Amino acid sequence: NQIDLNVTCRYAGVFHVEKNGRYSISRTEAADLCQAFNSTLPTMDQMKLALSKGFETCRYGFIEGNVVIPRIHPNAICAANHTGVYILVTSNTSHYDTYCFNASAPPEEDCTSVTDLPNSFDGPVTITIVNRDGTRYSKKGEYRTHQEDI
Ligand SMILES: CC(C)c1ccc(CN2CCC(O)CC2)cc1
16 A cells, blocks of 8 residues: 655745656545645646746646646647646546645745655555655655545
């Protein structure tokens, strides 16, 4: 019973979370996952400020109200060469990665590793936070509150 959560640098408190190395998070699980990091789904304004501080990914993820990819550099295989906060318009499917926003994080780029999952609850899952530099933090718990996400 294990969940891997790959996380990024934070940019103005915004960061990306990928579960189990695949697009696999529903919108309800995304809100619960951010809550386990004392975080919320970013607003579009919070994501735009994070982009202006240097944040970009090549993965679709939830924010409040939309599924997006923040892009700084045009790349043909990431949001079809667009820059800015690219918004997904048409898709058949419902599972993506998520973005999260922590108001207590530093105001600009924070590329230190994540070393805690502060607001997970009691549970039986081994949850492992995996940083881009490979460093890991594991704890036994749960974060999902909706049965259909388990
Ligand atoms: C296998 C067993 C040890 C276990 C332990 C804990 C849970 C999650 N737990 C369930 C009840 C909820 O009110 C809160 C979270 C599930 C299963």
